[PDB]
């Protein structure tokens, strides 16, 4: 639908999600991408026109995509999907040609309180806890460095 919300400045799609950590902070909850079933990402989704804040979207998507309930304990701020829709060298560095972001992500750290077996997307995805090291590799394999930046801002133990 066109319940979707876009940055009035950049036209980027506004998305909220959760870095869901175990109480002991050693593991993060990851879900499989719907499109590519072997990519592990974190729960996230489009803000809808009715939603009063990013926390509402984040907790709605964490339940819908991962069957996860918990408490928001930190605002992890924003990251951008800077994937292009070719290059510009500058003497001692190279860059992709200027473009607006595809997506602006608002991420929150959640402490997991419960995982349920039945949730709206429970037949369309897997959901599993990973150590920092495994999660980092997962998000590089998924080609989602912005999701890794959000994970790095979380209190997850990096030992
Ligand atoms: O609503 P759409 O425009 O189709 O957005 C999709 C959708 O993102 P949302 O969950 O934010 O709606 C996919 O996510 P899921 O199907 O996994 O829930 C996501 O795929 P990822 O799983 O890899 O995030 C994909 O992004 P991609 O470009 O990687 O296909 C992204 O499309 P956009 O490129 O338009 O954001």
Author numbering: 20 to 104, 113 to 186
Task: Copy out sentences from the published article reporting this entry, exactly as the authors wrote them.
The yeast diadenosine and diphosphoinositol polyphosphate phosphohydrolase DDP1 is a Nudix enzyme with pyrophosphatase activity on diphosphoinositides, dinucleotides, and polyphosphates. ScDDP1, like its human orthologs, adopts the canonical Nudix fold showing two β sheets flanked by helices. The longest helix (α-1) contains the Nudix box (GX5EX7REUXEEXGU), which displays a β-loop-helix-loop structure that binds the Mg2+ ions involved in diphosphate moiety orientation and catalysis.
In this binding mode, the unique axial phosphate at the 2– position is directed toward the active site. Several water-mediated interactions stabilize the inositide. The mentioned residues are involved in the binding of all inositides studied in this work.
